[PDB]
Design a protein around this ligand. Sequence first.
Ligand SMILES: Nc1ncnc2c1ncn2[C@@H]1O[C@H](COP(=O)(O)OP(=O)(O)OP(=O)(O)O)[C@@H](O)[C@H]1O
Ligand SMILES: Nc1ncnc2c1ncn2[C@@H]1O[C@H](COP(=O)(O)OP(=O)(O)OP(=O)(O)O)[C@@H](O)[C@H]1O
Ligand SMILES: Nc1ncnc2c1ncn2[C@@H]1O[C@H](COP(=O)(O)OP(=O)(O)OP(=O)(O)O)[C@@H](O)[C@H]1O
Ligand SMILES: [K+]
Ligand SMILES: [K+]
Ligand SMILES: [K+]
Ligand SMILES: [Mg+2]
Ligand SMILES: [Mg+2]
Ligand SMILES: [Mg+2]
Lengths: 489, 489, 489, 7, 7, 7, 7
Amino acid sequence: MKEIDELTIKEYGVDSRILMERAGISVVLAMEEELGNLSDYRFLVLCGGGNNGGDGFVVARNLLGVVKDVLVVFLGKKKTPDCEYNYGLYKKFGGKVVEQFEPSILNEFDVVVDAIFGTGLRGEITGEYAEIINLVNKSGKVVVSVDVPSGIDSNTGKVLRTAVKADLTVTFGVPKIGHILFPGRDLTGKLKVANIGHPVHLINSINRYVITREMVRSLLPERPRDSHKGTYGKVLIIAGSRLYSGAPVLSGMGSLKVGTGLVKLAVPFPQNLIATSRFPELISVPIDTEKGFFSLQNLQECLELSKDVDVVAIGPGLGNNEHVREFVNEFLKTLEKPAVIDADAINVLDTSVLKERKSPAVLTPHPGEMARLVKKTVGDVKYNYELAEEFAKENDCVLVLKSATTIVTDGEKTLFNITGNTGLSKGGSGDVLTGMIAGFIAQGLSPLEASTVSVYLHGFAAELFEQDERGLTASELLRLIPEAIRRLK
Amino acid sequence: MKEIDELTIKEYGVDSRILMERAGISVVLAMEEELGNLSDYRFLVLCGGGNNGGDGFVVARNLLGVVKDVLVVFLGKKKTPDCEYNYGLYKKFGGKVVEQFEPSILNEFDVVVDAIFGTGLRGEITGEYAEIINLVNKSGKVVVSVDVPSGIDSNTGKVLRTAVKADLTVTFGVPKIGHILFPGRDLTGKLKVANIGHPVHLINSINRYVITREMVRSLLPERPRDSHKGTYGKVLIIAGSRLYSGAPVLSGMGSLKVGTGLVKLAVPFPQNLIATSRFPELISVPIDTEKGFFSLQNLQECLELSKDVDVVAIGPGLGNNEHVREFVNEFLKTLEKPAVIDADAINVLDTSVLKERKSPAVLTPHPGEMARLVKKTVGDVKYNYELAEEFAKENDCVLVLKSATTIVTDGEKTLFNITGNTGLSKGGSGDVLTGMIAGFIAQGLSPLEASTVSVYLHGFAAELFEQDERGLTASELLRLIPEAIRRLK
Amino acid sequence: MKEIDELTIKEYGVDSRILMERAGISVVLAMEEELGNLSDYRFLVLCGGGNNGGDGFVVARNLLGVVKDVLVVFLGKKKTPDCEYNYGLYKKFGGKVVEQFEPSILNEFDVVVDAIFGTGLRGEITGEYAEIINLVNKSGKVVVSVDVPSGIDSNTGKVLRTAVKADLTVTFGVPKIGHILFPGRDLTGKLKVANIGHPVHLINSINRYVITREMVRSLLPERPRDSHKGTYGKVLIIAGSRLYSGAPVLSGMGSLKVGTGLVKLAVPFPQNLIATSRFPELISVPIDTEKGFFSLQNLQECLELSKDVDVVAIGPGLGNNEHVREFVNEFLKTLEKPAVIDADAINVLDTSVLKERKSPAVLTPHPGEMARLVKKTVGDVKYNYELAEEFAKENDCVLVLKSATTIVTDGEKTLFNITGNTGLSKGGSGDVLTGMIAGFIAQGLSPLEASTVSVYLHGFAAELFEQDERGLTASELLRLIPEAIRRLK
Amino acid sequence: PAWLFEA
Amino acid sequence: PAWLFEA
Amino acid sequence: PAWLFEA
Amino acid sequence: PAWLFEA
Ligand SMILES: Nc1ncnc2c1ncn2[C@@H]1O[C@H](COP(=O)(O)OP(=O)(O)OP(=O)(O)O)[C@@H](O)[C@H]1O
Ligand SMILES: Nc1ncnc2c1ncn2[C@@H]1O[C@H](COP(=O)(O)OP(=O)(O)OP(=O)(O)O)[C@@H](O)[C@H]1O
Ligand SMILES: Nc1ncnc2c1ncn2[C@@H]1O[C@H](COP(=O)(O)OP(=O)(O)OP(=O)(O)O)[C@@H](O)[C@H]1O
Ligand SMILES: [K+]
Ligand SMILES: [K+]
Ligand SMILES: [K+]
Ligand SMILES: [Mg+2]
Ligand SMILES: [Mg+2]
Ligand SMILES: [Mg+2]
């Protein structure tokens, strides 16, 4: 995007001042859309010495004589050329700038326009800057952030010591990663993405995307009327144990609710009977185990079962002991079908096995599972999209790193999911998603497409729950998936 | 406004390119507001070699990659610097320009953006330009005009041989006189006035205004609860004759419907009885005349009647013969009260009398009456605001020159009224307005304020008629005035 | 239309049987539209020996096996070839025909399809035919007439001794005059006009038309926004007397309510004051008369008044005595303006005067006035469109012969008006229409166009009266004209 | 729709 | 909201 | 209409 | 009404 601005100026020949004017007017129009008529509000515009601040001067200037009051507090020690030109215009148009910030200044204003730092933020915020930001955050005023709330690192979404909490963030060209990942996503408040005049070809050149409704709608497979169950694929799910009897059910129904033709579970007896007592449209094959867990003794029967399906999901509720590890790894090494690898199958996975497989894979870890898979801490892997990209590329797989924002990548393309709510922070949610992914692969979508469509619909189904989200359970999520699908169209 | 652009560039220091960018984006946003989503439309943008065309290139460029198709036909022989910069940007962004216009080109487009000439139009349009404009006008496509429809003189509203007929005109800063006066007002279609970044102080520096709802609302006099009829003034109307018995009635009710406390008519007997048979709240004084018309024999009685009122309206239906002329002129020469002078009182008026009067006057001619008053042709006075200004200034009066757009001026300030419809093109309409003006003067408004408020409310009342406007009559207009007043608040 | 059938068969080459099939199926579809699903009804189809009966056999045949019962009573003594072919088909498809009619047969049927006589009816109906028709009319059953109810002369609308009273008449190609004029219009019930496959060029070749909404909408003059009262014309109405003071008022308002710019009445003093006491937007000029009626002493003043208008209406309430006759005739002989001639001006008119006039005229007699004008009986002129055509052609005028169906002709084109109700059978209705016609001529319509538009809108205004039509008066009709105009668009 | 029937 | 457009 | 703003 | 058309 820094490249995108540079290229639009230096190669397309758009004057930097024109981009800055377009930026500032976007902010004004966005504020109108969100606040109604602006003429009765008093505005405090906080400007840094960079181009974020220059954008702020354009805002301040365009409000002069139209709103009740405008004041700029200029907080920098020097001005870039664009900021300087705009500062000059603001003053020439009669605008008041002060350079001293006063704790009680927030008193006489209704809206704070935060133009202190955008993408040029480098390093922790301290000193006056920190104080001012902490004052704004205690004030209860309406806060509108220019580009990115000041103090959010726009590449990571991390808070650099402190950051503005915005009601509205107006960003230019494309969303920044720091609007998408938390905590930045939380501080952004409502996000509007403004077109400021970059050529559309450059804007579409970005390789990381937010999964949208329109993208998911164009990926949903077709339902030709002259069809039969095999048209819509066959999934095998290897799952469950005597400790964990519920997981297979949630995964199997997850495949069926997204439109899969046939779903077969392989589950240790008698825990297999649990699935059809709840959902008799599932096939739940009893697997004879020594102690209630899959082991090498079950390898041959599972590979046999695999021959007559399109995709295999493995992992939810398998448990994690040595015999499960031996079985999961030998199985995956031999299985020549796409695999969806989750939960305890990830906990025992030997990643060499992924490298040697000819057929594809999707892995669906939460950060604790990712952390153990790559031998790092939760904090190093959480929201770490570059690590996820390297992992997917090195191991030839699609990685779905689950969290309130989910990252989906094959190492070349990375997509970010923002649907969902905290009702999904509850046992059983993951199991459902695993079924959904396998189901969509069986219907003909690529592992990456299948993952994209499933994370979005899974979170969107959660949002459609009628009562308080904290009461949502996996069973109710399943009931909601077909409404999510209908609403997507 | 040319001064306004120059001053914003040369003294405030806004780069001309920034004004041009703001102009072009206004047009795009206005088109969205009016057409909805633009992404399915095909646009033909016609650009002249001036800054109007430069605005057009900004439009074309901002549509690239967002709509179905964009084509510019460049029709000039050379380009101003701003147009050239924008033309260069449009091409650099991948835009197609052709310089040959082809009669069938309109075929493959849905919207024509007319950026051929704006305020720089000089002289009749001929040649290719004329052909292209005539083609656009026969095409049935959606036409959006940049600044002013090409071929309208923006200072007068006249068509310079031919002009574009627009569905939507997007103008910058302030309405131009050529959007306000006909025929230009008709060719403008729907007008949006866009703020492109001129300092608000310069925009408010324009001396000619369009009468708005908000202006009229702020001028309506107060109705203090502890009031009595004298609080709201007293009007005398000298009007009527044996030929013209209806006019006094319409004028008198016009004063009462705008809230005047007392209204007295002086009308030749027995034609005076006509007024109270219809509206018994009117006082209609019988004047004894020799032959059914006012003459010098009635001077003394009229001046007596004048002593106990605040304002006098004179003229509607008096007739026009020598004795009326002698009476009207001697009366006005002696009357030391504000006068509202209409109809036959204008037809007989000696304008020297206006110069010698100490008290104020409003004159309310239609163009035929103005033409005879200044000894010019109808065509020379019609919509001739500069002539109206000179007349008002020379004779110390307010001039209300009635037409579909009405001009109201005291020689310093000129206001244009755009309310009304063709139902007012019917006998009796003028008589009503005369009463309204006198009424508002009696309530405490200046002659100019009274005229401003009355022309607006008179036309607005017409618009509120429930059935087809051609069936509107003066009597029904009167019934509508109090609803117009309520809707203004 | 007989020509039209012949030409479609013999020159276009459509087989007569195809036209007959298309006719019969039209009747079935029309019956569905009007009765809903037909499957539960029992049908008695009465067929004559001609092609009307042949149409009836096509109907009967197309109902077989779809409705509860079908029976044909064939009433002729022989069959035309088309009727014979269809009779043969009806029988081959299993249909029952009886040739004896039985008074109690109506008992077991719900719908009677009347295909006894259409346009081939010649002479009075007697004998069995008459009995059967009288039986059908006493039966209370649903009656559907094929082409024209049997016993109506399709060229005149007269009843030839007796005729079927239909709930629904399905006619082919174009309405017949006998559906349009009474009593036939009354016996027709609801009329549907079916396209049976005649070339559209032949159907449009008919010279007599029913005035439709769409025709009137395309004739309404334009209301250009930049207009003034003179744009919309000036009417003089010469009307009234000491006996008849009301008529001028109704005529003058009639011109104003259809959108005329200026309306002037000339009325004997003091009866002129009546007009402005009711409607002060009228100019009502006092005319000094010896005894309360226009006479030659008023000729010069009326011709003077005529110079400044576009059209003159004369007649309503003038009275009818020798001096009125002398005045009306000398006036019309000298008047070089279009004239609208009504009421007492018709009663005194010397028709030589019409022949010598260079300017046009519309005459608006009711049949009593027409009868006296041409020295015939009311019964010979009533609904006599050919006589009206000859009169208009001989005297170079437009004739508007008023009745529940009004005939409007210039001798070449004849139009029939079917709007209106019995509330217009009341004094003052004619006076209104006279004003309307003059008004539309003043606005730029031809005498014929003006008459077409006015008769339709006049009757349509009557229909919009909210309460029982018998309570409608002329004053309330006037109030309704602008709603009629709005509804036309 | 008035291909078949005019009112 | 009339920052951009006056009617 | 999303010429200016994407949600 | 289904004289002409069956769905
Ligand atoms: N706050 C949140 N907002 C949006 N999505 C969330 C949130 N919390 C959890 N989720 C989603 O719910 C799913 C949780 O799967 P995960 O495997 O972490 O836990 P789990 O459901 O306990 O596992 P299991 O289903 O095996 O019990 C993931 O898609 C994750 O993205
Ligand atoms: N097309 C129109 N649109 C808006 N206003 C109009 C239109 N035509 C006429 N008017 C208004 O109606 C009033 C007409 O007054 P004017 O004195 O011209 O004619 P008049 O009503 O015949 O005069 P009088 O009332 O003496 O008969 C004016 O305010 C004029 O502005
Ligand atoms: N039953 C009816 N249906 C439709 N229109 C009718 C009916 N009866 C009368 N009319 C119409 O009303 C108008 C009557 O005009 P006419 O001159 O016959 O009588 P009038 O109103 O008494 O005359 P005046 O207005 O001079 O008193 C005509 O247009 C006529 O067509
Ligand atoms: K910021
Ligand atoms: K233009
Ligand atoms: K018949
Ligand atoms: Mg899980
Ligand atoms: Mg006037
Ligand atoms: Mg009559």
